[PDB]
Amino acid sequence: DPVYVDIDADSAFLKALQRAYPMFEVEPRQVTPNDAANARAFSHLAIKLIEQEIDPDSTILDIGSAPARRMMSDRKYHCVCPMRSAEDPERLANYARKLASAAGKVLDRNISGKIGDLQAVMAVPDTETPTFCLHTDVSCRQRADVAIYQDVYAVHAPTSLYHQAIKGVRLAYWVGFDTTPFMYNAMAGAYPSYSTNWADEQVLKAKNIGLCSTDLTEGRRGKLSIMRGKKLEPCDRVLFSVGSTLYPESRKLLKSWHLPSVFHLKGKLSFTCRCDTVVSCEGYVVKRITMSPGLYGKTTGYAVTHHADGFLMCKTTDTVDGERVSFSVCTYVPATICDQMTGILATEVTPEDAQKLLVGLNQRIVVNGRTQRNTNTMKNYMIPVVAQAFSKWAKECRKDMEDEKLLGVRERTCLWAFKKQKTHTVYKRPDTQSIQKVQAEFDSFVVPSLWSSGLSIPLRTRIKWLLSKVP
Amino acid sequence: YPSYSTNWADEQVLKAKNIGLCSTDLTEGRRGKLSIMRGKKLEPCDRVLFSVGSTLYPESRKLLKSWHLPSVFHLKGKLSFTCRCDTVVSCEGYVVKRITMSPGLYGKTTGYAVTHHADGFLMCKTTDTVDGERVSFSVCTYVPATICDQMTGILATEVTPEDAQKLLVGLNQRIVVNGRTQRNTNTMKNY
Amino acid sequence: YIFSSDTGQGHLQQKSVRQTTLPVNIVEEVHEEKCYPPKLDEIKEQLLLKRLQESASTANRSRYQSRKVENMKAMIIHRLKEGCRLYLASDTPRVPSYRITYPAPIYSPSINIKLSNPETAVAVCNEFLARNYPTVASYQVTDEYDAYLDMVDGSESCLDRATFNPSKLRSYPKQHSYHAPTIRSAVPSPFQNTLQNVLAAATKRNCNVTQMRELPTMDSAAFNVECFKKYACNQEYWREFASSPIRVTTENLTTYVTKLKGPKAAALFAKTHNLLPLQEVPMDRFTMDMKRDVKVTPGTKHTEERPKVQVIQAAEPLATAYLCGIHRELVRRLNAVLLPNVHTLFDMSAEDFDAIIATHFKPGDAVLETDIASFDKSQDDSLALTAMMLLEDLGVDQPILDLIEAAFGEISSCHLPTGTRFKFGAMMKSGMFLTLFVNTLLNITIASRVLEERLTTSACAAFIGDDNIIHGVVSDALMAARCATWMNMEVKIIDAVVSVKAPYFCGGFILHDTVTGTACRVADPLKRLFKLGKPLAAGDEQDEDRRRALADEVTRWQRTGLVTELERAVYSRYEVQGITAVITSMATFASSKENFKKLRGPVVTLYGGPK
Amino acid sequence: GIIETPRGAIKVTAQPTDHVVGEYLVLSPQTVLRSQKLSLIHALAEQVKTCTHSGRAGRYAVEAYDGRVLVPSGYAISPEDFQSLSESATMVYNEREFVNRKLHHIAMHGPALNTDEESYELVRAERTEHEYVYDVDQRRCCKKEEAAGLVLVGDLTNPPYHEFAYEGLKIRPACPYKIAVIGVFGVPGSGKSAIIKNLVTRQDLVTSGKKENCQEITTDVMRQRGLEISARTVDSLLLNGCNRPVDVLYVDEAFACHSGTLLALIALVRPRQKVVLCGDPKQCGFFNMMQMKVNYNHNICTQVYHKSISRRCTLPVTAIVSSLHYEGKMRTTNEYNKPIVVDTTGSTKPDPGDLVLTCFRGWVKQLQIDYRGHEVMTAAASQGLTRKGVYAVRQKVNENPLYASTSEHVNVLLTRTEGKLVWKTLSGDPWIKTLQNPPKGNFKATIKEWEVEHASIMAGICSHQM
Ligand SMILES: Nc1nc2c(ncn2[C@@H]2O[C@H](COP(=O)(O)OP(=O)(O)OP(=O)(O)O)[C@@H](O)[C@H]2O)c(=O)[nH]1
Ligand SMILES: Nc1ncnc2c1ncn2[C@@H]1O[C@H](COP(=O)(O)OP(=O)(O)OP(=O)(O)O)[C@@H](O)[C@H]1O
Numbered sequence A: 001d002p003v004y005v006d007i008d009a010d011s012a013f014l015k016a017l018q019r020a021y022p023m024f025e026v027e028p029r030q031v032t033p034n035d036a037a038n039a040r041a042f043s044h045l046a047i048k049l050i051e052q053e054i055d056p057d058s059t060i061l062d063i064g065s066a067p068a069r070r071m072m073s074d075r076k077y078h079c080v081c082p083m084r085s086a087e088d089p090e091r092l093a094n095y096a097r098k099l100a101s102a103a104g105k106v107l108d109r110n111i112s113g114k115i116g117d118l119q120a121v122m123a124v125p126d127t128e129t130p131t132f133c134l135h136t137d138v139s140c141r142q143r144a145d146v147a148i149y150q151d152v153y154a155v156h157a158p159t160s161l162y163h164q165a166i167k168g169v170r171l172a173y174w175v176g177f178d179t180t181p182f183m184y185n186a187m188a189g190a191y192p193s194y195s196t197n198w199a200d201e202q203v204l205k206a207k208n209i210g211l212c213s214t215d216l217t218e219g220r221r222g223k224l225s226i227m228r229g230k231k232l233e234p235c236d237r238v239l240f241s242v243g244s245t246l247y248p249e250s251r252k253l254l255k256s257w258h259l260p261s262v263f264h265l266k267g268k269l270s271f272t273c274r275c276d277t278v279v280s281c282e283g284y285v286v287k288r289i290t291m292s293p294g295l296y297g298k299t300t301g302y303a304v305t306h307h308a309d310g311f312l313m314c315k316t317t318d319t320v321d322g323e324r325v326s327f328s329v330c331t332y333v334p335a336t337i338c339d340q341m342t343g344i345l346a347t348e349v350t351p352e353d354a355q356k357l358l359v360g361l362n363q364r365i366v367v368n369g370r371t372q373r374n375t376n377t378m379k380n381y382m383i384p385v386v387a388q389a390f391s392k393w394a395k396e397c398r399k400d401m402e403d404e405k406l407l408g409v410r411e412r413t414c415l416w417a418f419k420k421q422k423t424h425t426v427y428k429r430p431d432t433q434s435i436q437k438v439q440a441e442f443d444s445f446v447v448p449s450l451w452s453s454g455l456s457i458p459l460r461t462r463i464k465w466l467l468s469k470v471p
Numbered sequence B: 001y002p003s004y005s006t007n008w009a010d011e012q013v014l015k016a017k018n019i020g021l022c023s024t025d026l027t028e029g030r031r032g033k034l035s036i037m038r039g040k041k042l043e044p045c046d047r048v049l050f051s052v053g054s055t056l057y058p059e060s061r062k063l064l065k066s067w068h069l070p071s072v073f074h075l076k077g078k079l080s081f082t083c084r085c086d087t088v089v090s091c092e093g094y095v096v097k098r099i100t101m102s103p104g105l106y107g108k109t110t111g112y113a114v115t116h117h118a119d120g121f122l123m124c125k126t127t128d129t130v131d132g133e134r135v136s137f138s139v140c141t142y143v144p145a146t147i148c149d150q151m152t153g154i155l156a157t158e159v160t161p162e163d164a165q166k167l168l169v170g171l172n173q174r175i176v177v178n179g180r181t182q183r184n185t186n187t188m189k190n191y
Numbered sequence C: 001y002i003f004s005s006d007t008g009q010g011h012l013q014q015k016s017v018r019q020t021t022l023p024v025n026i027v028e029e030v031h032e033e034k035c036y037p038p039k040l041d042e043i044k045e046q047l048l049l050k051r052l053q054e055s056a057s058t059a060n061r062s063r064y065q066s067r068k069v070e071n072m073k074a075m076i077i078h079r080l081k082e083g084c085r086l087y088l089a090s091d092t093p094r095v096p097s098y099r100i101t102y103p104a105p106i107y108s109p110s111i112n113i114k115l116s117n118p119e120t121a122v123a124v125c126n127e128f129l130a131r132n133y134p135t136v137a138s139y140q141v142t143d144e145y146d147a148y149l150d151m152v153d154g155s156e157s158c159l160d161r162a163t164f165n166p167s168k169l170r171s172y173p174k175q176h177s178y179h180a181p182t183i184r185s186a187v188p189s190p191f192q193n194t195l196q197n198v199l200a201a202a203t204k205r206n207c208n209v210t211q212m213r214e215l216p217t218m219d220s221a222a223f224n225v226e227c228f229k230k231y232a233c234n235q236e237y238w239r240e241f242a243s244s245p246i247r248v249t250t251e252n253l254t255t256y257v258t259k260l261k262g263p264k265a266a267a268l269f270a271k272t273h274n275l276l277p278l279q280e281v282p283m284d285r286f287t288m289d290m291k292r293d294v295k296v297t298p299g300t301k302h303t304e305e306r307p308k309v310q311v312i313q314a315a316e317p318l319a320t321a322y323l324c325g326i327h328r329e330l331v332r333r334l335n336a337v338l339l340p341n342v343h344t345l346f347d348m349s350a351e352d353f354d355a356i357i358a359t360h361f362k363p364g365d366a367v368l369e370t371d372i373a374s375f376d377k378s379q380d381d382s383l384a385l386t387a388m389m390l391l392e393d394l395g396v397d398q399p400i401l402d403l404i405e406a407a408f409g410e411i412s413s414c415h416l417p418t419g420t421r422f423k424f425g426a427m428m429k430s431g432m433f434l435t436l437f438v439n440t441l442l443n444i445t446i447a448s449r450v451l452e453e454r455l456t457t458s459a460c461a462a463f464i465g466d467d468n469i470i471h472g473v474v475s476d477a478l479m480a481a482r483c484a485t486w487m488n489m490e491v492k493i494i495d496a497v498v499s500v501k502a503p504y505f506c507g508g509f510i511l512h513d514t515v516t517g518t519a520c521r522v523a524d525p526l527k528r529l530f531k532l533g534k535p536l537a538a539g540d541e542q543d544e545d546r547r548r549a550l551a552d553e554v555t556r557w558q559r560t561g562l563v564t565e566l567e568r569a570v571y572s573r574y575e576v577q578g579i580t581a582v583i584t585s586m587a588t589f590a591s592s593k594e595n596f597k598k599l600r601g602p603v604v605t606l607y608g609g610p611k
Numbered sequence D: 001g002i003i004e005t006p007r008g009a010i011k012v013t014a015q016p017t018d019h020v021v022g023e024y025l026v027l028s029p030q031t032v033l034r035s036q037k038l039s040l041i042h043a044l045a046e047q048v049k050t051c052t053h054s055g056r057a058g059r060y061a062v063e064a065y066d067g068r069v070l071v072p073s074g075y076a077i078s079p080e081d082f083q084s085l086s087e088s089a090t091m092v093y094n095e096r097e098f099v100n101r102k103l104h105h106i107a108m109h110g111p112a113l114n115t116d117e118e119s120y121e122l123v124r125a126e127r128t129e130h131e132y133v134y135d136v137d138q139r140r141c142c143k144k145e146e147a148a149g150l151v152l153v154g155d156l157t158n159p160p161y162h163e164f165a166y167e168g169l170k171i172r173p174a175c176p177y178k179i180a181v182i183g184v185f186g187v188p189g190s191g192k193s194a195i196i197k198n199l200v201t202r203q204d205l206v207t208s209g210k211k212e213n214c215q216e217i218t219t220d221v222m223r224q225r226g227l228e229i230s231a232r233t234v235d236s237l238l239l240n241g242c243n244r245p246v247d248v249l250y251v252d253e254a255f256a257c258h259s260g261t262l263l264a265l266i267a268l269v270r271p272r273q274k275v276v277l278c279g280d281p282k283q284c285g286f287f288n289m290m291q292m293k294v295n296y297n298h299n300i301c302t303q304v305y306h307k308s309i310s311r312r313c314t315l316p317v318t319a320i321v322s323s324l325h326y327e328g329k330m331r332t333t334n335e336y337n338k339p340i341v342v343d344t345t346g347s348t349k350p351d352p353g354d355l356v357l358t359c360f361r362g363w364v365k366q367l368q369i370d371y372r373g374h375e376v377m378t379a380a381a382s383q384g385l386t387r388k389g390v391y392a393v394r395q396k397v398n399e400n401p402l403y404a405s406t407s408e409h410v411n412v413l414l415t416r417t418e419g420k421l422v423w424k425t426l427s428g429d430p431w432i433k434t435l436q437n438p439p440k441g442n443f444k445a446t447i448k449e450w451e452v453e454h455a456s457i458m459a460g461i462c463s464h465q466m
């Protein structure tokens, strides 16, 4: 019954894991020094929680999953495995090798069925098999009732969900990052608890952000370019870096998963949908979607996010390829730090004073008999940018206290125009909600195409030879 | 590389004065030196000298840079393959790389390489005298994580180089917090 | 010292903070005192100095020193702040505290009685001494040749781990000028600075070795802190204090330096050119100082044996300036964790002490007074561990603890004039800036462990230095058995009864008034009486601060309803009769400048003048 | 639970099911104090106190130390025997974990450098040539159970003698045995040795005294007379189980041992005939490892004969000893004069009689650093034999509480038998009282007076009643 995770025994992330999963008990057991250990521990516990609340003897659709992970599970899985990625061949070869080595040593795991399923598919690519297929989400023609997504950011959420509901699916799950920073139209950000940094294509040559690179120079007073520019706005291309692995993503598909509370799917058949958040821990969320046939209720087109920790978004100045520009950066702040800062933001503080006080509140020296250790609450490299945000916030709130307006009227006079004030910092305190306007009515989903066999003969021969032995 | 007692330098600055691998001699200094051809240029060349302990190894830059492979790349020829590269173990300068190769040609490439820093990486401009003439170039090194964390509060204002040097000596000498058993041990090489 | 010295300066303050205008006790909140930040200004000094030359009657000079001292204070702050860059920190949110206040005291009227002829006052005092102390009144028959007699006989000493140069041991007297006293009390003159006196002072042998930091030592310390926290403290502050450390802060240094006087600031400024960093200052090196005054008590003991020589061990001047900003916070935290019926004299005045014990002591009540001076704290190493454990619980930051600990181990002392080296082991009494605090903590711990739960159920307990008084406690065999674990003379205890055997506290008497019916504390008259028979060194002009101190002390003695009680208290302590006449004699002496001149005489010069 | 007192006598019932060893109850010191029924042993409750804390963490980290009080239960005994029985059982229980913590403390933290703890090392759990070895995981002493981690060895780790006594309480008797407890007084080795040497019975076993004392009588009886008397020792007899009851028991030098231990020892064997306890009570006893004071050491006796003849071992210098330690009834016969000896600086070299035999336990460790080339061994805990030679070392003449006047440490001045006496004590001492004016009582009556008590002492063992 104990659940074992690959976390160091002295890590401070263990306490956060326990409060997020109070129905389990977690014991650390480290076997490898992976650079993204925290990002994998959460995913492991999420799968265990889902399987505990799913009715048994029911088939499950797993979209875009490596089949080597669902081998020892006692449930029924149908893996959809297209071959449009650069690391698919390794996963397929590893799955075949592990399957062959497991034959004859495991009593009841349906190993023989899996072996027969793989051989049948390799003979005819277009065949359909209960445990394996090479179609896409909109091409698979196998009926089920539960669908599971895991770290998928390459599909359109309304279009993909509609095709699943046609086959008769009434439940779905999603595991991944938090979409809220991308709804604010930010340029760069970071998730410090999981050692993840993301940035835009146009700021990859910055100097003082999480993910950048530059070089030394002397500085010249003249240089000409054919691009006038004069406009720095976010684009559709975004780079992700989790640990030491790179992932290219797109903004349009990321924002499509910020579903509203209630929405309708209208087409040949009609459905009514909902969306809830069950687990949230410092950036990772788990979502549950229910689908029913018919058309009921009314829609409002609003999305609500609940903040347990502080959320910051400020404006910074940096040099990109030698030129000084300005953009926006977002991050997360622990709740304990935010509560202890309430006293000093009642006055005006310079950035230097804020930085010094934050350092004192963060670092402590701990002695255990004769050993000495230094302990930190949050990562140190984000302190300078955070200190700037508090200084600006404390100044904007004061100005509202002298220019007091009348109650119930709008000031609009020499000309009938109203002045718009400047804003440089958005700060969301703990126990505060944010609301956004999105779309709730979806009509067109027609995306016809032709299916092409994504496989090669050299790969087919290698798999067949590997799956050739008397057991 | 201070942790493994390794120093490397370029061919053109082997006669420096205050770097890891150099040598020079005493001189009084005179007025004016007539050269043979034009200089006015100091850029890195293709020849680099390594020194591990007391052993010497010559290297070339072109072959060294060819091993910094990206995440995904394609090999096209008579046959086609798809490849990936990952970093498994990293410890203060040594890495272990794992590469998998598969037959076929399908996917997409972006042409980027990512390095994750567990310690501090530093590079700056320094002024030295090479064979009696003053020049400027760049030097890189590594810093332990503990020293970087404890210097956050001091770098909030302008600090004098002599003031910063005294603080660094005080920090390095104080980490030992002992001496009945471990005498005087330093987390940073003093040179 | 504590209440008041001979010049009326004392150690306590003069501002009341424990006074209320209601007939009941009211709990209040402790606040902070804001300090004016010093500022630098040079143009003002230049113009004021020139304007000083053209005209300066009396106040023009005073503006120059105020401007000059203010400049020095700003310079010290700028230099001192740069040294401790690795230890400086910022201000964190503070933990609030509360304190109890008491109503104002009530006093009886005073009537002044004095004689007229000052010579008759001397005769009465001399008659009093001869009748009660026959041997003391016949010692003086010639001049003061004590220095010559000390040179004729050799040098006797009992040293341990010391080195000295035998070629510099020579003690021929130098010139000595003084005024002949009129009172026949034979109070000796301060000793001369010679190598012979230094060796005589360091005739103490405390060579004892036990377990330094082993398991048996830790077990004893662990029990001691358990008794202190269980029988003398409440549990509402420990967890909050541990979370918030105490660190060196700019406000601590700014407040500290501003409180220094003129000459003290100038002396500190002279030692700021070659400013060593905080981590470079040694914490186990001391210097030896001799300049003191001999201590004499009533009785006949100084006319038969030579008194001892007092010494001072001075620490590094920079050591006591870097870290002396944390004393105020330590006092506040200690007062917060103590029980309401347990009191400490820190941060009080004379009036506040009277108001606290106004309605607690009544005639026929047993009071236990105990001192711990006669105890060898160097024998056991657990006495130092207990203090550190209490300090750690109070919330002292970890690297600062190492600096403090370095001064409680092996130390060395040096005498600059002669180059004499001394080495001492574990020592508690020193000249550092935590001496009263550690002694007070140990005094409370010893009493709590011995008395167990009898300390909790009490009316009033006061602890300061090496003296304490506890109400409603008698002497039984249980405390004797508990204290006889190692030996028997650890502490000295005395039983006192109000209105029968007056209790003694900090060189004073606790008496219960008759007209009003309240307790009060007064000074010791016999201690003053012997002090007027002390010769005055030539060239001293401090004969005006003493008259004011005597005038204040005389007025407190003549309060109605305390004359009879004072007579019985002195007789029950010293077995002497006839002190009302002495008090009257003191009254006429402190009435005018010329009346105070009758206590001196012609100037006598010895060992001087080649004629 | 409840404690019943039937008509003065006190008996305790063991109805609580808490931790009990053998037939002894375990309870907290605080419980004993808060009970007027147990007021007879309240002194021990105070002593066992001041040793109960709940650990500490930080720079100065320790572990919780809990002490308990042991009392007999189930048997109706006299109130006086209740006091002594509790002291013996309680002391053993507190002694065992004192060593256990010391070994556990060394494991977690770092051993001290300028000490003797380097004799304890960390050893792999496989190579365990040590027959018994101490483990850290369960903080006990175990032979071979695969102690995970890294196992500790040490000096006392080799024989776990502290652990060899914890199980002894299981078979420890509680009911005292009723028997005529008679005893022989006076300096030993005159007739009391000869009672068990020349006129000992068939079924008696020589188990008394130190292991050397057990064997000497066996060699003495066989060589002189015979009678095939075997030899066990007190430590083995008390720890190991007993056999066929002894007819008549002739324990010697038992007054060094604690009274409560003797009470259980007599009842564990149940002697048939009388029991005599020889060996003089005027000497050093069983001391104490933890210095804990003993207050419940009462005495049991039936006879009064004292052997006043004072053997042939004293001298005129110890006439004060005949007036300082004894009241004066110890008039001697000895013709030994030897005016006062301080061994000056260049007196008699290492020779027989000059054997280095210290009598000060706190000075034993300091003996080997200053005096190492003359002789070896110590007889402080082995006194009373026919060694006929003593020499105790000295370091200082100030603040010596270990040996002072009435202390038993000085009392070894008169050599343990008839023999030779020396002391190197400094020539010239602050005080000269013990060597200037000895009492002028009867120095020597007759040699015939000696040959009287050897028959009358036995007459009080044989002809008085049998
Ligand atoms: N932005 C983004 N993050 C991903 C993606 N896939 C996985 N991750 C996250 O990266 C973290 C670490 O990746 P891994 O668990 O090592 O992936 P894997 O399944 O073991 O196999 P590889 O991708 O070859 O390393 C996971 O916990 C995911 O949260 C993706 O496609 N896009
Ligand atoms: N339409 C789809 N339906 C089902 N699975 C898909 C679909 N598209 C991709 N996948 C699978 O999900 C994973 C993502 O494939 P993708 O083409 O996005 O790789 P990529 O180039 O590295 O881009 P990214 O880093 O955003 O994932 C692949 O393993 C793929 O098999």
Ligand SMILES: [Zn+2]
Binding pocket: A078, A079, A080, A128, A129, A132, A133, A134, A135, A140, A141, A142
């Ligand atoms: Zn399918």
